[PDB]
Write a protein that binds this ligand. Structure first.
Ligand SMILES: [Zn+2]
Length: 197
């Protein structure tokens, strides 16, 4: 804990080669803050994303106003049936790509994650780096036991890919969320610790 500056330096170096900033207007300080939070992710994962030419696209407006996500206009996200909401209303996505609306990091800004950028980037790490580890037999057993223990039982507790992404965000956001994950989901915590060891 005496050389965190070096890990941040390396991870921000990596992120400067992954993050793409948008045309048009946004809060530059908040975009910088999002990158700073991403810099807590283990550098091995960040460098694996970089090798795969994954770009983390920060957006100045709605997700579906980007040409590459216009196919989601009017579409209801998985698990959002009955809400009257669509992807037009959702500030981030992760998987084969990552796209994130600047300013919408905190829980409740159109999404349910503890932190937008960490949750969405976790989806990309799951898919691109870890070969869909959230669907592995090992993770299935952990999810069967612990998958409701971050709440949102009808969403996180039903979709292992979402429980993986949310647990990853708790692990990496700050010391408080990291400790909360250890207490609530000890096997998931140990699983994530060992992946990065
Ligand atoms: Zn998600």
């Amino acid at each position: 804990s005496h050389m965190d500056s070096t890990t941040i330096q390396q991870n921000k170096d990596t992120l400067s080669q992954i993050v793409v900033f948008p045309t048009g207007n946004y809060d530059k300080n908040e975009a910088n803050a999002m990158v700073n939070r991403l810099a807590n992710i283990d550098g091995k994962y960040l460098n694996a994303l970089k090798q795969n030419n994954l770009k983390i696209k920060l957006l100045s407006g709605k997700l579906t106003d980007e040409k590459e996500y216009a196919y989601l206009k009017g579409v209801v996200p998985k698990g959002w049936e009955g809400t009257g909401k669509t992807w037009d209303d959702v500030p981030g996505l992760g998987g084969s790509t990552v796209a994130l609306r600047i300013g919408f990091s905190n829980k409740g800004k159109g999404h349910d994650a503890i932190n937008l950028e960490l949750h969405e980037t976790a989806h990309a790490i799951d898919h691109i780096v870890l070969n869909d580890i959230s669907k592995s037999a090992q993770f299935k057993q952990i999810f069967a036991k612990e998958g409701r223990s971050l709440g949102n039982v009808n969403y996180l507790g039903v979709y292992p890919e979402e429980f993986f992404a949310e647990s990853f965000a708790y692990y990496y956001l700050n010391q408080d969320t990291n400790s909360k994950l250890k207490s609530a989901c000890p096997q998931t915590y140990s699983f994530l610790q060992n992946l990065a060891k």
